[PDB]
Amino acid sequence: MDEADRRLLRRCRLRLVEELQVDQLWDVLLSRELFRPHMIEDIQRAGSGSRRDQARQLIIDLETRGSQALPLFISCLEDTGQDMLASFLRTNRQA
């Protein structure tokens, strides 16, 4: 992941952890080979296991999953009906 994408993920930290729905997201992430299944189990157990803690670990770990991790992640957002969040992300990448 390039520095600009990483920086984007940090800038949007608050919004991501506040709004990301994860339970519905795992299938999408798998389909696009963003994470291996055990990686997902680890993220699921991050911290207290709340939605927020899972979300946070997801987006941190996301930075390590490749050059195209960010656009692929936006797509998974789209695929799971999180258009608003995906929209917030995209309009930054472009910005």
């Binding site: 963003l34 994470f35 680890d42 390590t64 999953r65």
Partner: protein, 95 residues
């Protein structure tokens, strides 16, 4: 390991250090018999993900052809497509 392999690691070291989540690599390498428990404990003792990756690579640079392959395979197997691609041309002949 062969100089080709080692130089390939050296060239891409920074990318590797930034992305590798060692807990998903060291296991494979231990199973394969090319990383020791004490090396793994030395890795684990580093406080951050990138520091652990850095330590692990330090260790691997000193190992043999088989080890490089073990590393590469684990990378590929754990979905680090881009990272494996960087290491592909540096794969040494083994056995």
């Amino acid at each position: 390991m062969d100089a080709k392999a080692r130089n390939c690691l050296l060239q891409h070291r920074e990318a590797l250090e930034k992305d590798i989540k060692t807990s998903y690599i060291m296991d494979h390498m231990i199973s394969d018999g090319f990383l020791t428990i004490s090396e793994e404990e030395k890795v684990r003792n580093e406080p951050t993900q990138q520091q652990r990756a850095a330590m692990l690579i330090k260790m691997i640079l000193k190992k043999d052809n088989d080890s490089y392959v073990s590393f590469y395979n684990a990378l590929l197997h754990e979905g680090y497509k881009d990272l494996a691609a960087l290491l592909h041309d540096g794969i040494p002949v083994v056995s």
